[PDB]
Design a binder for this molecule. Structure first.
Ligand SMILES: Nc1ncnc2c1ncn2[C@@H]1O[C@H](COP(=O)(O)OP(=O)(O)OP(=O)(O)O)[C@@H](O)[C@H]1O
Ligand SMILES: Nc1ncnc2c1ncn2[C@@H]1O[C@H](COP(=O)(O)OP(=O)(O)OP(=O)(O)O)[C@@H](O)[C@H]1O
Ligand SMILES: Nc1ncnc2c1ncn2[C@@H]1O[C@H](COP(=O)(O)OP(=O)(O)OP(=O)(O)O)[C@@H](O)[C@H]1O
Ligand SMILES: Nc1ncnc2c1ncn2[C@@H]1O[C@H](COP(=O)(O)OP(=O)(O)O)[C@@H](O)[C@H]1O
Lengths: 354, 278, 144, 48, 37, 369, 102
């Protein structure tokens, strides 16, 4: 008949297939005896087919097995642990470094840590100095540390990884360090990788002494990340970026150089820094051509890099009132005084560097 | 059937391509402890009868400690390259899995692997995850942590008083530990890795600055003069940042202004005191 | 209301589902509670005031959840609380490193008592000897 | 005994877990009608 | 408690001299090194 | 007939008790050098299609060469599939199920409250409609000016002024998937389980694309993070840092609108007052004069009221009250008429309700004036 | 012990015994049995018992089957001796954690 016939015979063909057990090979016993471990539990000794290229079956590899006879079927690449899949190819597209403004000094210092050693590795060799491994961002909130990470993410898109730093913990005594094992093993397999560890202050912190058995697991997740940072096996083409709001509460073993080579400071924006931020955010606004940004930037001191985006948002709200369509500079002066009214119940951040 | 004596261990040796290529002469200014760790590992292989005719009761383990970044992991990394005996390295917090008793089971698998293979050197970095004095807080998780210590303490006592499985382990805080780990019949030999002094700063600076250019207009002893509580890792960060600064100016030659900007970048967060107190 | 749901329907009012008892010790609050549980024609559920204070974090909110769900399952039950100062009346922050978990339990109670689809035809009795160190959210009518 | 989590439409097709054994997709027997079979209560399941 | 460490590290310093002897200068350096810590 | 017999044989094999499982990742197997005839195998080199690896519900991960009666392109790692019991072959793709606590908080009762019952606050109801109702109804009006939709509203004040009315009002009007969340529901037993809870909470709001999430009593989880001890605060700060990143920052979303409420704001972290977390800060003062006379008029709508009462005298006499206290005046006044049995009210019914609400203790103040 | 013409028994007993949780409940049993059957002797026991238990706060907390060990030691310390042939000496540090008032 039509394709209903051809779909049916492939449907009946597929049902005769069976599953296969997944296991790992410990060592090679003889030319036909192989000791394997099923990952759910018990270990066995098995044999190959005849032509599976037994030189390739190395200790530690992953391989499939049959059900009844339990013999070696086909070697497979290393596992990916689909929690790691959810943080690898998940980021939507972002526009480039044009939207971020006023941080051009801190922009270039991150470029020299990440992009330059992989694009131009010869020039560091010519001097003969190993490039730095990782960098740390810190500062008051709302100045764009996460947006800076989005700018680097949509720049070459090498192997960018987004750690939430709160799903690292779990309900069991294990499975927290074991996820960090599979993350860096995924980092070793794909060599030019970038790890982004946002909000480290959850998992990180200081070293206690007989606090709580709950803190013992959070610490056991902590100094494991210290160990896989430098440890025994050094890293290659792996750069880790981490950001927080309080750098004083971090561990001194976390903040020592070698694991965090350069500390990057992001501060509250200056007069010209608040000016061109406002130029970017007021770009797609159908304003009437009388707007003067100089008076607007004058009554905004101590603002973040994000309250100015709220200022641009609130001016359209006053345009929405009586549906005036065009935005008039009087609404910009009115919306500024509304925002600075709200910025009086959250202050005194000023955390000590490093 | 009877297998060959190590078949399932689920942990392998340091192979032959995993040598981390750190030379002994790469380490500068550690001869008070490089020589100590050399005589505490390979020397009692031959001279074992000299302990018995004097009565020192030769040690099995040595525990390193110090401020975080004085050179602890690299010395263990250094002796992995220049050993002829087998070497086994394990993560200090990898036997914490979510089953019943796989922790003590794989700890027994390590020492069985270490005994039957060779007179090997077992290195277990960061034991603070396991070696806490603590107490039996009835939560459902601490009992496996304690019995891992009990399995570790039972197996470090009675090998034969002749097998040359040397044990080496290292922390940064050697205070939150059970006192039986620092007791005889177990890991006894004590070495501290303190912050360097003026002479050892010269040796670390000369070794690191022997591979890039250093045009002769750069003084080296003038940066040694300010004490500033400089660790081992701060020297490498100074040389990297000064090199990266010269990279940024499209220059392959390190100058004296590069070291000054590196010195301000690495160490400036110390000036916090009020004038009227003194 | 639990025996004559005829007067309030024709007069169109609502009964005060929360009543607080207070006074000097040994005056009859326990006797009034037993007298209420005498002729209740309903299900009576007593609460020890320090039962909710527990060692692990967050379990007291689970007791309040299961308690109000058991209240919602049957028809027209009566909650009795005794010694409400143990559950919590203060809102201290003067270096707020002291009690916070029992504040979370009180907050989950405070939320389940009122607002966003309220409980229904249940009533709440409370009793304490010092009704001056209590939460102003508790003293707000609609709950007490 | 078992715990139900999700119910499908038209056809019953309930997603279920036992306590720690496994999770399944099952049907109700002819002994009971499909009315008091809502999500979030324990239900007994034949072992075969 | 430090006297035991004095004797063991005195034996250590005697062993570095490649002798079965335990000399006086071994004890002097023993006191100095143990006292230092 | 010939094809329908094959259609009959397919439905025979899929009986009903399918085990469920998770898909780990999808693979693809290349052919080998030369497969020997007389010892060849179909489930090998001669399969250029797709493949998958599946972890079962019994924590045993198996492998399958043929995916089966599912299109391969629809499957993504992290999904749930209805595999068999013997061949362990994929049969059906199920809707993804969530945590049992997450499955309970969907607003299904659909309450009904109009805006006229919150008389006294018409300035605050103007912007609260503005920051919520306009984006999911008029996308084209905001897009013509083209700036950004709002993100989050904080409502706060003294606890009697009335804030849960406006939360219940917006669930009454909008036909979006309103979602209800409490403060201390997020604080859980073990470590973890709050990070999983908020992530599951936002995931349920993703598929129901017009949705409002409401968080009540934000001062429970969301206290000021400082240098302290113990594990009680550190678990809450772990869930707060999970909340802030999933709300604004990486992966921005328009389709989820968050509403937060509290009674104190000095305790909240300043990171809650950032860009997209809390957009507007809304006050709720105590009712002054005409709001108090408006409140008693609203609540006494059902009650039989004698038509010689003037509410301005009540509003003048009742001082330092709120919405709930003026509500309690009306209920108490209606009972006093029931005590004497009179149907319609009077002025002195209200005044005795006033004297009960103030809760004045025994005085002995007879040495004044 | 040597000058009183008695044998000396030293009890290590810190944590290697308590690995099989209730072995302490037999540790204080059989030891005392040998100290009752061998000779006039003394028993030397270290700080560890105070490390093992302080009081019965673990009676409502769990006892980790160690305070019960202390409890077992308690009755076997009481028993009926009146010197007889068994005596005990306590050597310890930080005396103010255990329950010497009872
Ligand atoms: N003597 C030395 N000479 C040169 N560099 C050194 C020396 N000692 C340490 N370093 C530097 O220290 C780093 C190696 O790790 P590090 O010595 O800090 O580990 P560690 O002492 O075990 O520290 P931690 O306990 O913090 O993990 C490298 O950056 C290396 O340049
Ligand atoms: N009006 C009363 N008539 C009869 N007995 C009374 C009366 N008031 C108190 N009692 C007696 O007082 C005894 C103890 O008082 P009760 O148990 O009521 O304490 P309470 O008022 O609840 O106080 P508290 O909870 O502070 O201890 C009761 O057993 C009861 O017999
Ligand atoms: N302005 C008002 N007009 C009419 N009724 C009001 C007003 N304000 C509050 N109410 C009454 O308050 C009751 C609901 O409690 P309310 O909204 O005051 O609590 P809240 O402030 O949101 O919460 P919380 O007690 O947690 O602070 C309802 O019975 C409602 O009629
Ligand atoms: N330099 C800047 N220029 C323009 N907008 C900025 C800038 N910095 C921050 N923003 C605004 O702040 C938001 C990002 O906030 P967030 O990532 O929370 O900052 P942080 O993580 O540093 O607190 C963005 O939506 C962006 O609109």
């Amino acid at each position: 008949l039509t394709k209903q016939y051809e779909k049916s015979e492939n449907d009946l063909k597929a049902l005769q297939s069976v599953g296969q057990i997944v296991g790992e090979v410990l060592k090679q016993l003889t030319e036909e005896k192989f000791i394997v471990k099923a990952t759910n539990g018990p270990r066995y000794v098995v044999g190959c087919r005849r032509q599976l290229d037994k030189s390739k079956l190395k200790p530690g590899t992953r391989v499939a097995l049959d059900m009844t006879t339990l013999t070696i079927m086909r070697y497979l690449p290393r596992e990916v642990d689909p929690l790691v899949y959810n943080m690898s190819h998940e980021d939507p597209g972002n526009v480039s470094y044009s939207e971020i403004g006023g941080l051009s000094e801190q922009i270039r210092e991150l470029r020299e840590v990440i992009e330059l050693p992989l694009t131009n590795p010869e020039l560091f060799q010519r001097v003969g100095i190993i490039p730095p491994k990782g960098c740390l961002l810190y500062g008051p909130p709302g100045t764009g540390k996460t947006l800076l990470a989005r700018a680097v993410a949509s720049q070459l898109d090498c192997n960018f990884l987004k750690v939430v730093s709160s799903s690292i913990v779990d309900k069991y005594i294990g499975e927290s360090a074991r996820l960090i094992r599979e993350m860096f093993n995924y980092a070793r397999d794909h060599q030019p990788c970038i790890i982004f560890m946002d909000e480290i202050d959850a998992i990180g912190g200081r070293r206690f002494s007989e606090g709580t058995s709950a803190d013992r697991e959070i610490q056991r997740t902590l100094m494991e990340l210290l160990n896989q940072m430098d440890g025994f096996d050094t890293l290659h083409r792996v750069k880790m970026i981490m950001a927080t709001n309080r750098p004083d509460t971090l561990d001194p073993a976390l903040l020592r150089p070698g694991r965090l080579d350069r500390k990057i400071h992001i501060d509250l924006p200056n007069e010209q820094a608040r000016l061109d931020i406002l130029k970017i955010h007021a770009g797609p606004i159908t304003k009437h051509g009388e707007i003067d940004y100089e008076a607007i930037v004058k009554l905004s001191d101590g603002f973040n890099g994000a309250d100015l985006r709220n200022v641009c948002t609130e001016a359209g709200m006053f345009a929405i009132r009586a549906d005036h369509d065009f935005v008039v500079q009087e609404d910009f002066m009115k919306a500024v005084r509304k925002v600075a009214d709200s910025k009086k119940l959250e202050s005194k951040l000023d955390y000590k560097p490093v | 059937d009877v297998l060959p004596p190590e078949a399932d261990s689920s942990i392998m040796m340091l192979t032959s391509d995993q040598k981390p290529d750190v030379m002994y002469a790469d380490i500068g200014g550690m001869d008070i402890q490089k020589q100590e760790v050399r005589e505490a590992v390979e020397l009692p292989l031959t001279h074992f009868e000299l302990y018995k005719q004097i009565g020192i009761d030769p040690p099995r383990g040595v525990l390193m400690y110090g401020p975080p970044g004085c050179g602890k992991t690299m010395l263990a990394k250094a002796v992995a390259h220049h050993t002829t005996a087998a070497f086994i390295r394990v993560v200090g917090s990898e036997f914490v899995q979510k089953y019943l008793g796989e922790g003590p089971r794989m700890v027994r698998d390590v020492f069985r692997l270490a005994k039957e293979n060779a007179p090997a050197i077992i290195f277990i970095d960061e034991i603070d995850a396991i070696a806490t004095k603590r107490f039996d807080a009835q939560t459902g998780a601490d009992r496996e942590v304690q019995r891992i210590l009990l399995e570790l303490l039972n197996q470090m006592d009675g090998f034969d008083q002749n097998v040359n499985v040397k044990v080496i382990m290292a922390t940064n805080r050697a205070d939150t530990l059970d006192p039986a780990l620092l007791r005889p019949g177990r890991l006894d030999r004590k070495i501290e890795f303190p912050l360097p002094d003026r002479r050892q700063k010269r040796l670390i600076f000369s070794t690191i600055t022997s591979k890039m250019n250093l045009s002769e207009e750069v003084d080296l002893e003038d940066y040694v003069a300010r004490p500033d509580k400089i660790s081992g890792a701060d020297i490498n960060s100074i040389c990297q940042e000064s090199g990266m600064l010269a990279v940024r100016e499209n220059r392959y030659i390190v100058l004296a202004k590069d070291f000054e900007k590196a010195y301000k970048t690495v160490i400036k967060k110390d000036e916090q005191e009020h004038e009227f107190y003194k | 209301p639990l025996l004559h749901p005829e007067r309030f329907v024709n007069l169109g009012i609502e009964p005060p589902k929360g009543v607080l008892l207070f006074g000097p010790p040994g005056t009859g609050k326990t006797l009034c509670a037993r007298a209420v549980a005498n002729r209740t024609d309903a299900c009576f559920i007593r609460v020890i005031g320090s039962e909710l204070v527990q060692k692990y974090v967050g379990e007291g909110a689970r007791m309040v959840r299961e308690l109000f769900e058991m209240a919602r399952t049957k028809k027209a039950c009566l909650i009795f609380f005794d010694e409400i100062d143990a559950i919590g009346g203060a809102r201290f922050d003067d270096g707020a490193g002291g009690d916070n978990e029992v504040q979370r339990t009180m907050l989950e109670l405070i939320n389940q008592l009122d607002g966003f689809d309220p409980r229904g035809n249940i009533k709440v009795l409370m009793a304490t000897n010092r009704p001056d160190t209590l939460d102003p959210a508790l003293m707000r009518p609609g709950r007490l | 005994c078992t715990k139900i989590i999700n119910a499908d439409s038209e056809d019953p097709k309930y997603i279920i877990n036992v306590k720690q054994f496994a999770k399944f997709v099952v049907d109700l027997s002819d002994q009971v009608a499909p009315t008091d079979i809502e999500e979030g209560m324990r239900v007994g399941v034949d072992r075969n | 408690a430090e006297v035991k460490g004095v004797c063991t590290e005195a034996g250590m310093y005697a062993l570095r001299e490649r002798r079965v002897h335990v000399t006086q200068e071994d004890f002097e350096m023993a006191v100095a090194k143990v006292m230092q810590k | 007939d010939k094809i329908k017999e094959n259609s009959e044989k397919i439905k025979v094999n899929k009986t009903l008790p399918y085990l469920v499982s998770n898909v780990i990742e999808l693979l693809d197997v290349d052919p080998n050098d030369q497969e020997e005839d007389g010892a060849n195998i179909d489930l090998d080199s001669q399969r250029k299609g797709k493949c998958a690896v599946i972890k079962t519900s019994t924590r045993q991960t198996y492998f399958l060469p043929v995916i089966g009666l599912v299109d391969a392109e629809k499957l993504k790692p992290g999904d749930l599939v209805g595999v068999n019991k013997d061949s362990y072959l994929i049969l059906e793709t199920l809707p993804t199920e969530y945590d049992s606590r997450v499955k309970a908080m969907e607003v299904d009762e659909r309450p009904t409250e109009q805006y006229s019952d919150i008389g006294g606050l018409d300035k605050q109801i103007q912007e609260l409609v503005e920051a919520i109702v306009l984006p999911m109804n008029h996308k084209e009006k905001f897009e013509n000016l083209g700036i950004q939709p709002p993100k989050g509203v904080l409502m706060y004040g003294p606890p009697g002024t009335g804030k849960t009315l406006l939360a219940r009002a917006c669930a009454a009007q909008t036909k979006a998937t309103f979602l209800k969340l409490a403060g201390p529901q997020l604080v859980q037993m073990f470590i973890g389980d709050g990070a999983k809870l908020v992530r599951d909470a936002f995931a349920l709001a993703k598929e129901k694309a017009p949705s409002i999430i409401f968080i009540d009593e934000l001062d429970a989880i969301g206290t000021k993070r400082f240098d302290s001890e113990k594990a009680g605060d550190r678990e809450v700060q772990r869930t707060m840092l999970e909340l802030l990143n999933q709300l604004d920052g990486f992966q921005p979303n328009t389709q989820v609108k968050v509403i937060a409420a509290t009674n104190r704001v000095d305790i909240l972290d300043p990171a809650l007052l950032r860009s997209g977390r809390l957009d507007r800060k809304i006050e709720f003062p105590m009712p002054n004069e005409e709001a108090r006379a408006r409140i008693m008029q609203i609540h006494s709508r059902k009650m039989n009221v004698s038509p010689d009462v003037n509410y301005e005298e009540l509003a003048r006499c009742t001082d330092d009250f709120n919405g709930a206290q003026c509500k309690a005046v009306c209920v108490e006044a209606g009972m006093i008429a029931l005590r004497r049995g009179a149907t319609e009210l009077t002025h002195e019914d209200y005044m005795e309700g006033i004297l009960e609400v103030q809760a004045k203790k025994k005085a002995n103040l007879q040495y004044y004036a | 012990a040597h000058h009183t013409d008695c044998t000396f028994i030293r009890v290590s007993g810190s944590e290697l015994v308590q690995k099989f949780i209730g072995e302490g409940a037999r540790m204080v049993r059989e030891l005392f049995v040998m100290a009752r059957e061998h000779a006039p002797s003394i028993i030397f026991m270290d700080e560890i018992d105070s490390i093992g238990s302080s009081r019965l706060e673990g009676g409502s907390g769990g006892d980790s089957e160690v305070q019960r060990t202390m409890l077992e030691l308690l009755n076997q310390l009481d028993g009926f001796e009146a010197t007889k042939n068994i005596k005990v000496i306590m050597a310890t540090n930080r005396i103010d954690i255990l329950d010497s008032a009872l």
